Amino acid sequence: EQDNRFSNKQKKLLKQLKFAECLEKKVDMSKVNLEVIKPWITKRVTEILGFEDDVVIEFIFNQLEVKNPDSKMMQINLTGFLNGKNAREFMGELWPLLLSAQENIAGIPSAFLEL
Amino acid sequence: IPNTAHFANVTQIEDAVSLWAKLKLQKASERWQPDTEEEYEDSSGNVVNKKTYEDLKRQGLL
Amino acid sequence: LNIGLQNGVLLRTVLDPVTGDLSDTRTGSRPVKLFRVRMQGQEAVLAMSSRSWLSYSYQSRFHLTPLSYETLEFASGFASEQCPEGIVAISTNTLRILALEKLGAVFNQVAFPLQYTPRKFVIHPESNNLIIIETDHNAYTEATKAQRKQQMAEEMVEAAGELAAEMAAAFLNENLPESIFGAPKAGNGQWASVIRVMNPIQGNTLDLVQLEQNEAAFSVAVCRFSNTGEDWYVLVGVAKDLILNPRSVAGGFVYTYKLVNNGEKLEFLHKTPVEEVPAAIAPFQGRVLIGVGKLLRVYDLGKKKLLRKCENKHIANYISGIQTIGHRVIVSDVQESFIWVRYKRNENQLIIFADDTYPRWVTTASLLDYDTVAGADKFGNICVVRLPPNTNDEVDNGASQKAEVIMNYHVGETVLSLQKTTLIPGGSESLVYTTLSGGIGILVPFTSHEDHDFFQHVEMHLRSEHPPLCGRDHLSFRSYYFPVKNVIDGDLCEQFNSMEPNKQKNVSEELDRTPPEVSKKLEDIRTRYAF
Amino acid sequence: VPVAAAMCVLKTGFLFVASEFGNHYLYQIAHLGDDDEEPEFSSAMPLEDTFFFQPRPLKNLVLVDELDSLSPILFCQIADLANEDTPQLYVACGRGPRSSLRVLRHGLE
Amino acid sequence: AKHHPDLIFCRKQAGVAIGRLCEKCDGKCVICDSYVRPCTLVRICDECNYGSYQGRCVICGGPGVSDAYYCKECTIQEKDRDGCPKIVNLGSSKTDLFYERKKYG
Amino acid sequence: TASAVVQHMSLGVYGFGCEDSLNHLLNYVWPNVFETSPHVIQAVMGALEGLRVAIGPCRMLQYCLQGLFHPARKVRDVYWKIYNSIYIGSQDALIAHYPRIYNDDKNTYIRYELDYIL
Amino acid sequence: SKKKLRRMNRFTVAELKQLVARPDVVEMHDVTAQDPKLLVHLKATRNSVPVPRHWCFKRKYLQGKRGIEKPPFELPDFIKRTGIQEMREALQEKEEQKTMKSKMREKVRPKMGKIDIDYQKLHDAFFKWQTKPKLTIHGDLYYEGKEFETRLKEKKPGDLSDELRISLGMPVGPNAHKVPPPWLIAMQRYGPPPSYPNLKIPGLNSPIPESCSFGYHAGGWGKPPVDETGKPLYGDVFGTIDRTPWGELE
Amino acid sequence: MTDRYTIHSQLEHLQSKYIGTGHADTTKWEWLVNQHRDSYCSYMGHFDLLNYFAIAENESKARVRFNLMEKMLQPCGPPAD
Ligand SMILES: [Zn+2]
Ligand SMILES: [Zn+2]
Ligand SMILES: [Zn+2]
Known part of the structure; x- marks a missing residue:
């Protein structure tokens, strides 16, 4: 904002991290039902953590409810709470499920279409 | 090949030669040779360079 | 009050119980006769001494302007239904009702139309006739225009339908003047050019040559080669297949015409091809210099084609202009600068002997004397460049001895024509430039450190107490590209008169003078060089 | 009308046109130009090609005034090509078919 | 102030609020740190002008008493065109001398 | 301290054509560009920006040109710092000053509008 | 890699x-x-x-x-003319003779108006006797040792000097042209040196420089070279527009 | 290391607040590309290079303006790779 002697650490990670695979196809949120996903997110993380962390839950929710989310930024922000590779796998697992739900006509992922 | 500035830091002889050749071509380009360019029309209105002009001039004809 | 004398002079004054302050000019050594006449919303005075000189305040501005007609004898105002306002003017064996038109003016115009953009013109000195080249990108030469108009009518006929419906005749007979509907012209590499010999008295066009479809005319010169007699020839450089923004050409030609019928009709002699657009031609000691791209060749007149008598290959970029004082040649190219060049006559050489220290997109030049050049810039600047006193005229980063730049000024608009000349009779020399937005200005030398210093102080104090209107800084403006050097702003100095007299007196007190003397000293300079 | 760098349609039914090169014009409006045998194009009308028209001299405008202007001055020369003792300015001027050669002299006509 | 490399400006967009000087700081420029030929007045960022920050020394931070100017040299090189020149950080020297004193007496 | 003198002297004599003097002193101030003392290097920087407004940006760019793409990197560091400071103030006056840089195989580096003749 | x-x-x-x-x-x-x-x-x-x-x-x-030692700065001529130098030398030597006692004594009882200098000489020195020094053209950077280069590229024999002619036994000053260096005798004898076909000799290949005399006594220009027909051997040993500045102050 | 990325910091700042600056790692492409873009924005500001160009070709100032602003998105080829 006012300082020059510090670098943008986000951009630095934007260069120097190892990211997930589905993180390219931009995604909109109008086309999505979330309240179907929400329990999936909850159980996913709660297992990753062995306990429940409401704040991480709501963090992911709030980062998603935007018009179009940045998968890069989201993987970064979860890298702290989860163990880094867990974040890569988790995001590259949810984001394709997002693509599925969004090309679905009801907006729901094919996993819960089947189940 | 004259020990001039252009060949400093060149050490291999084949390189010095080749470079000297292209530099010969360069200076030849920028030089002005009247003998080859200066174009002369004869009394018959067609063009020669001044070389042939003076040639056939004193050669009894031009 | 106004007092005109009999050896043509007249002085104006205020009147209060004492004649306040005087001003004086001259109007031919013959009696200044005076006549009150109503003019354009004002009373004004005529004067006749040897020329009709109307004296009047234009929105409180005393301009004393000639008007253009023969000598006069007497006059006075006049009105009628036939003439809402005019002048009864009796002159040699005549009485005339005259009318004075547009009064807000310094020059008055008369326009002779043309067909395309005129890129250059030259005066033939005997018959006083203007040879004019004209060129237009992305156009159609006239022949081609009519031909392919015809051809599209050919297509249109073929609609196979009622045959009966013939818009052909209507099409080919309808002729929408381009002067009002625009030129029906397009293409991207398509040029269209023309030559025209015109008389300057009235717009009668003594002759008109029409070049082919993509032959574009870029330079013209009128000269006498010495190997023939007093035969005046006319040379016209012409590019062929030019493309503009990528750049490329097919190549140039130099058309030669004999300029016969005492100077009112061209006649083609020969076109000698050349390897790039000949953007500059100059007569030079009985032969002709020609810039061709980067090469600078000296040609002489051969009677099948032009002959290459000399050449230089060192000019930097692309020759845009060529001038010659008696034996020096100032080449001026498109991005570096002016380049001086010496013609070693007997040894037959063109040797570069000085150049410039700055990069500068010249668009025009003019020699002030043997040692000095003045140049304009594609960006708005004007410079004056001089050769240092001890230059070695004849010898035998990249140059030898450089030239010092002794003035620099940002005019504001591209200046495309400079010329050193005198305007009023008897008045002193000045350097007149004409911009590309329609402006005309002059630059005038100072003759006395006292003058120069008075004016330096006037403008220095105006800069501070009467700043530019829209926010800018005057010094920063005039130093837009290179900082100012040895020029003063008459346009800013002459805003004293429109300042508010409290401020007038503050400035004239910084000078320790009065607004009247300050204003008189503002206008004497204006008067001894220009209008 | 000439190509313009500004059209300023006043009240009083005047219309200023500031041509980009050459002289400026003050026109006066006569009719809003409607309901005649002139076609009318529309955004609901379909076509599969474009609709057309054909230009003609002025109908809705009458040229009231014309301001002279030297813009652009592609060349100039101060000479004495008359017999007068003063020099005239031979200005090669204007663009395109509106180009000109104007002679200027410090006088009044 | 051209003397202490450790400090920083607000640098955010200008405003209309004139700038003010403390009595220690009175009279000098704000960048050039000169003492002479002051030409133009200082205008400060609205944020750096809001609330408690009104009427203070741009440099010192104390109670502003006089209007801050720019020297003619800053005006000519156009260093007055960068938005709020308020130093937004205290520096080492203030707290340093303060602690040396509060230990001394 | 002679560099500080030159800074203030240029800012003062701006506009009066005392320019060959200032250029001559540029020839002596310029070699001090490879210094490392904070105070000597920022005195020289102040001098070069005073001289930019008084000598103009052409000269300053004729001085910065050859070292922007140098083999080394200390000299690229210094030259790009100087060039940035010439650029930031008077970045418009420079349009007329840049040098002609030819076009290679794939891109076109030449500005042709500036070679339109008219 | x-x-x-x-x-x-x-x-x-x-x-x-x-x-x-x-x-x-x-x-x-x-x-x-x-x-x-x-x-x-x-x-x-x-x-x-x-x-x-x-x-x-x-x-x-x-x-x-x-390494080396350096002479103090050298004042400009137009500043020497005013004699400030010897003035301040006098005071420096006086004050170096002074001791601490007398120094404090004059701190407490000054000798006001001991010495002076006049104005109008300072004013003439700055506003009427100033001169432009020799400046450097664009691009002559300075480097260590530039000022210990005599000069070079001076290929011309006409360029003579004062130390040169002195230790030649030839005069410098206004009579430099009429002063022939030791090279002109063998110049007339066997031509100019054969790298300098294009050098012209004062008094041997060119005319006598004004008011110099062809002759063979001390101070003359010899018997000028010519052939057996009467044509000079090099050049001519016997000597067979409107450049006004345009806008300038009166 | 320290000085390296701290002046890399200050120069990222300079550039990002001032498009067009450089650093020790500036390529020929981006140099000349900023140089072109500035040239265009100034042909558009300056009311008289706009005339010069509109007269040199045979267009109108609005079309010339439009063309410049079209070119301003890749004036020198595609990027380096
Ligand atoms: Zn304070
Ligand atoms: Zn300051
Ligand atoms: Zn702020």
Whole structure:
């Protein structure tokens, strides 16, 4: 904002991290039902953590409810709470499920279409 | 090949030669040779360079 | 009050119980006769001494302007239904009702139309006739225009339908003047050019040559080669297949015409091809210099084609202009600068002997004397460049001895024509430039450190107490590209008169003078060089 | 009308046109130009090609005034090509078919 | 102030609020740190002008008493065109001398 | 301290054509560009920006040109710092000053509008 | 190594010297530039100014200037004329004779108006006797040792000097032209030196310089060279527009 | 290391607040590309290079303006790779 002697650490990670695979196809949120996903997110993380962390839950929710989310930024922000590779796998697992739900006509992922 | 500035830091002889050749071509380009360019029309209105002009001039004809 | 004398002079004054302050000019050594006449919303005075000189305040501005007609004898105002306002003017064996038109003016115009953009013109000195080249990108030469108009009518006929419906005749007979509907012209590499010999008295066009479809005319010169007699020839450089923004050409030609019928009709002699657009031609000691791209060749007149008598290959970029004082040649190219060049006559050489220290997109030049050049810039600047006193005229980063730049000024608009000349009779020399937005200005030398210093102080104090209107800084403006050097702003100095007299007196007190003397000293300079 | 760098349609039914090169014009409006045998194009009308028209001299405008202007001055020369003792300015001027050669002299006509 | 490399400006967009000087700081420029030929007045960022920050020394931070100017040299090189020149950080020297004193007496 | 003198002297004599003097002193101030003392290097920087407004940006760019793409990197560091400071103030006056840089195989580096003749 | 791939890109110096249009410009390390074609093209542009010599030097800049001793600054002539120098010398020597006692005594009882200097001489010295020094043209950077270069490129014999003619046994001053250097005798004898076909000798190949005399006594210009027909051997040993400035103050 | 990325910091700042600056790692492409873009924005500001160009070709100032602003998105080829 006012300082020059510090670098943008986000951009630095934007260069120097190892990211997930589905993180390219931009995604909109109008086309999505979330309240179907929400329990999936909850159980996913709660297992990753062995306990429940409401704040991480709501963090992911709030980062998603935007018009179009940045998968890069989201993987970064979860890298702290989860163990880094867990974040890569988790995001590259949810984001394709997002693509599925969004090309679905009801907006729901094919996993819960089947189940 | 004259020990001039252009060949400093060149050490291999084949390189010095080749470079000297292209530099010969360069200076030849920028030089002005009247003998080859200066174009002369004869009394018959067609063009020669001044070389042939003076040639056939004193050669009894031009 | 106004007092005109009999050896043509007249002085104006205020009147209060004492004649306040005087001003004086001259109007031919013959009696200044005076006549009150109503003019354009004002009373004004005529004067006749040897020329009709109307004296009047234009929105409180005393301009004393000639008007253009023969000598006069007497006059006075006049009105009628036939003439809402005019002048009864009796002159040699005549009485005339005259009318004075547009009064807000310094020059008055008369326009002779043309067909395309005129890129250059030259005066033939005997018959006083203007040879004019004209060129237009992305156009159609006239022949081609009519031909392919015809051809599209050919297509249109073929609609196979009622045959009966013939818009052909209507099409080919309808002729929408381009002067009002625009030129029906397009293409991207398509040029269209023309030559025209015109008389300057009235717009009668003594002759008109029409070049082919993509032959574009870029330079013209009128000269006498010495190997023939007093035969005046006319040379016209012409590019062929030019493309503009990528750049490329097919190549140039130099058309030669004999300029016969005492100077009112061209006649083609020969076109000698050349390897790039000949953007500059100059007569030079009985032969002709020609810039061709980067090469600078000296040609002489051969009677099948032009002959290459000399050449230089060192000019930097692309020759845009060529001038010659008696034996020096100032080449001026498109991005570096002016380049001086010496013609070693007997040894037959063109040797570069000085150049410039700055990069500068010249668009025009003019020699002030043997040692000095003045140049304009594609960006708005004007410079004056001089050769240092001890230059070695004849010898035998990249140059030898450089030239010092002794003035620099940002005019504001591209200046495309400079010329050193005198305007009023008897008045002193000045350097007149004409911009590309329609402006005309002059630059005038100072003759006395006292003058120069008075004016330096006037403008220095105006800069501070009467700043530019829209926010800018005057010094920063005039130093837009290179900082100012040895020029003063008459346009800013002459805003004293429109300042508010409290401020007038503050400035004239910084000078320790009065607004009247300050204003008189503002206008004497204006008067001894220009209008 | 000439190509313009500004059209300023006043009240009083005047219309200023500031041509980009050459002289400026003050026109006066006569009719809003409607309901005649002139076609009318529309955004609901379909076509599969474009609709057309054909230009003609002025109908809705009458040229009231014309301001002279030297813009652009592609060349100039101060000479004495008359017999007068003063020099005239031979200005090669204007663009395109509106180009000109104007002679200027410090006088009044 | 051209003397202490450790400090920083607000640098955010200008405003209309004139700038003010403390009595220690009175009279000098704000960048050039000169003492002479002051030409133009200082205008400060609205944020750096809001609330408690009104009427203070741009440099010192104390109670502003006089209007801050720019020297003619800053005006000519156009260093007055960068938005709020308020130093937004205290520096080492203030707290340093303060602690040396509060230990001394 | 002679560099500080030159800074203030240029800012003062701006506009009066005392320019060959200032250029001559540029020839002596310029070699001090490879210094490392904070105070000597920022005195020289102040001098070069005073001289930019008084000598103009052409000269300053004729001085910065050859070292922007140098083999080394200390000299690229210094030259790009100087060039940035010439650029930031008077970045418009420079349009007329840049040098002609030819076009290679794939891109076109030449500005042709500036070679339109008219 | 991708570093060694960039190194595999690195032309040889003869590669560079070949491709570029001006090879002189190319130096050794120019090969190591991430843009060598640009770099050389920018080194070949007109009017630009080459990097300072000492970027590679291991010693710093005038830290190397170190060793020798130097004479004090030398005042301009127009400032010498006013005699401030000897004035301040007098006071320096007086005050060096002073001791601490007398120093404090004059601190407490000054000798006001002891000495003075007049104005109008300072005013003439700055506003009426000033002169432009010899300045340097654009691009003459300074380097350590530039000021201990005599000069060079001075190929002309006409250029004579004062120390030269003195230790030649020839006079300097206004009679320099009428003063023949020891070279003109054998110049008339066997031509000019055969690198200088194009040098003209004062008194031997050119006319007598004004008011100098052909002759063979002490101070003359000899018996001028000519052939057996009467044609001079070199040049002529016997001597067979409107340049006004345009806008200038009266 | 320290000085390296701290001046890399200050220069990222300079550039990002001032498009067009450089650093020790500036390529020929981006140099000349900023140089072109500035040239265009100034042909558009300056009311008289706009005339010069509109007269040199045969267009109108609005079309010339439009063309410049079209070119301003890739004036020198595609990027380096
Ligand atoms: Zn304070
Ligand atoms: Zn300041
Ligand atoms: Zn702020």
